[PDB]
Amino acid sequence: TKQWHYPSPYSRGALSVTSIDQGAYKRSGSSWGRPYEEKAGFGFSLDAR
Amino acid sequence: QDLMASGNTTVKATFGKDSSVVKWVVLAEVLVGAVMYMMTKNVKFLAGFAIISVFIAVGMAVVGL
Numbered sequence: 348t349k350q351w352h353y354p355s356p357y358s359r360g361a362l363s364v365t366s367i368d369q370g371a372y373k374r375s376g377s378s379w380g381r382p383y384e385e386k387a388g389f390g391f392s393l394d395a396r
Numbered sequence: 397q398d399l400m401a402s403g404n405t406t407v408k409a410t411f412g413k414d415s416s417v418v419k420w421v422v423l424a425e426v427l428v429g430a431v432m433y434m435m436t437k438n439v440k441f442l443a444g445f446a447i448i449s450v451f452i453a454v455g456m457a458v459v460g461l
């Protein structure tokens with residue numbers, strides 16, 4: 348308008364994952380035979396989403 | 397992780413050496429091999445008195461949990 352500017356919605360956000368823391372276991376045983384051884388496978392990685 | 401197909405030790409205690417399967421397979425030979433002397437009456441069915449303990453050992457000790 349001509350008196351005061353209305354605010355607008357805004358959002359970002361970030362889902363960062365460091366080490367895996369892988370463991371060882373195985374141881375051884377074986378048976379067959381051969382072988383075984385121781386280585387531890389068992390790592391089993393995880394998705395960052 | 398583990399698995400959901402086992403983890404109960406149920407089929408191992410039922411179909412194994414120290415179970416009841418070894419008893420139902422030892423009486424089936426004498427039920428028909430010791431009564432076939434009527435029509436045949438010949439020394440022929442005598443090669444099965446030693447292969448019972450051998451067949452049960454070459455199949456159960458394959459995986460062994």
Ligand SMILES: CCOP(=O)(O)OC[C@H](O)CO
Binds near residue numbers: 439441
């Ligand atoms: C001699 C032991 O028995 P078998 O090997 O079953 O004999 C084969 C013929 O049937 C003999 O008649």
